[PDB]
Write a protein that binds this ligand. Structure first.
Ligand code: HEM
Length: 399
């Protein structure tokens, strides 16, 4: 049994092991950091099964849960939020914050998302690049998702820049454990204050709705509200940043596709669809423990055994997506759902918001800067370490 998680084959590539497993051993055992074994599922159909089976659990206090690191094992000791819950607890808490993320709500949020993107791009243009390239991540990919989620949560305008930087520090690869932790605890402290304030004078934001609708009636306590708000912030921000950066890098790698997008920004939705399939930046979230014996393919997963269903591998499943390793924004989509946002009950709560942010970015970025170019050879892109989910640390650009 090989050690898992695997390392990416290269900066922009997924681990090389998956393709081989899908072809000769779709459901197999892998060895985790603590020496325990877990079942690795690599085929689309099997990943979908794992994501929806009622015989599988997300509760991390169950022995056998596939924690992939020492930190994950310690983090599993805290009171859980809906991300680590099973029915009926799961939807009971998730439904407390779903309103802002529904397809209808996101459609109505479009003008705000567009203004946020327009403002950040204008700021970038005014700063210019007359003295050399600027970091697309720091100047654009980071603030876009950050400002939006912070604003939706309830953070006032003047606090956005500092809070955006602090949240970045908690996941920055250059941060020391001490710094990441400090930033983490600081964001929690700040959210605690916001909850106290919104409890007194509610405004029109997520935190206020949690206070008025859940805390006051006694459905949850203040700390619960803080943790729910915290989850909404840290769950997908870093991923959004990385997806925007990867999108720009990808377009640079395939000139004709960029030419097509520039000539027709209406193709942004399909470009985003392909991006979320090709670059599965959240590939280690579909994990479970078997509550009872369950058969998957030619294997029997016994009660209390862990399972990791790779949506990354599923998105490269040749049986579902023709020429899976080819990035094609004009891809002819099959009836099967690509799995960039998961599947089943737990499917990303912000899938629609995320897609809206990405679509707004890629339908506007090259209209603003038609000559935007990465200022370093593409082969020198600074990607996240290979033993981590795919992403980009910084991206020098000129325009
Ligand atoms: C393009 C960026 C994003 C990608 C690719 C992404 C992908 C995912 C994936 C794969 C999961 C696992 C779903 C499953 O268990 O089947 C997930 C869960 C989740 N994501 Fe995201 N996500 C993104 C953006 C966001 C944003 C913007 C937020 C916050 C506003 C967010 C909040 C969450 C939460 C709260 C969960 C847990 C849902 C649950 O367990 O019920 N995500 N996301």
């Amino acid at each position: 049994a090989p050690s898992f998680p695997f390392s990416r084959a290269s900066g922009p590539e997924p681990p090389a092991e998956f393709a081989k497993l899908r072809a000769t051993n779709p459901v197999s055992q892998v060895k985790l950091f603590d020496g325990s074994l877990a079942w690795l599922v690599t085929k689309h159909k099997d990943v979908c099964f794992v994501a929806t089976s009622e015989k599988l659990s997300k509760v991390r206090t169950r022995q056998g849960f596939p924690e992939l690191s020492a930190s994950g094992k310690q983090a599993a000791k805290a009171k859980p939020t809906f991300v680590d819950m099973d029915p009926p607890e799961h939807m009971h808490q998730r439904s407390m914050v779903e309103p802002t993320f529904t397809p209808e709500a996101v459609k109505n949020l479009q003008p705000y998302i567009q203004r946020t993107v327009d403002d950040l791009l204008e700021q970038m243009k005014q700063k210019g690049c007359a003295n050399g390239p600027v970091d697309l991540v720091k100047e654009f990919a980071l603030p876009v998702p950050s400002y939006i989620i912070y604003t939706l949560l309830g953070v006032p305008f003047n606090d956005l820049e500092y809070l955006t930087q602090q949240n970045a520090i908690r996941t920055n690869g250059s941060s020391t454990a001490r710094e990441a932790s400090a930033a983490n605890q600081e964001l929690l402290d700040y959210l605690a204050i916001l909850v106290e304030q919104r409890l007194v004078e509610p405004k029109d934001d997520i935190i206020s709705k949690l206070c008025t609708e859940q805390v006051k009636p006694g459905n949850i306590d203040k700390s619960d509200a803080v943790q729910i708000a915290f989850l909404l912030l840290v769950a997908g921000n870093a991923t959004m940043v990385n997806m925007i950066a990867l999108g720009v890098a990808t377009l640079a790698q395939h000139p004709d596709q960029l030419a097509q997008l520039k000539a027709n920004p209406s193709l942004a939705p399909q470009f985003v669809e392909e991006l979320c399939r090709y670059h599965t930046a959240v590939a280690l979230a579909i994990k479970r423990t078997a509550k009872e014996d369950v058969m998957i393919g030619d294997k029997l997963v016994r009660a209390n055994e862990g399972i990791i269903a790779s949506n990354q591998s599923a998105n490269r499943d040749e049986e579902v997506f023709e020429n899976p390793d080819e990035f094609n924004m004009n891809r002819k989509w099959p009836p099967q759902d690509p799995l960039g946002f998961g599947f089943g009950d737990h499917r990303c709560i912000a899938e629609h918001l995320a897609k809206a942010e990405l679509t707004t970015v890629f339908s506007t970025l090259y209209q603003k800067f038609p000559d935007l170019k990465v200022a370093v050879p593409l082969g020198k892109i600074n990607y996240t370490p290979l033993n981590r989910d795919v992403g980009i640390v910084d991206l020098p650009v000129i325009f």
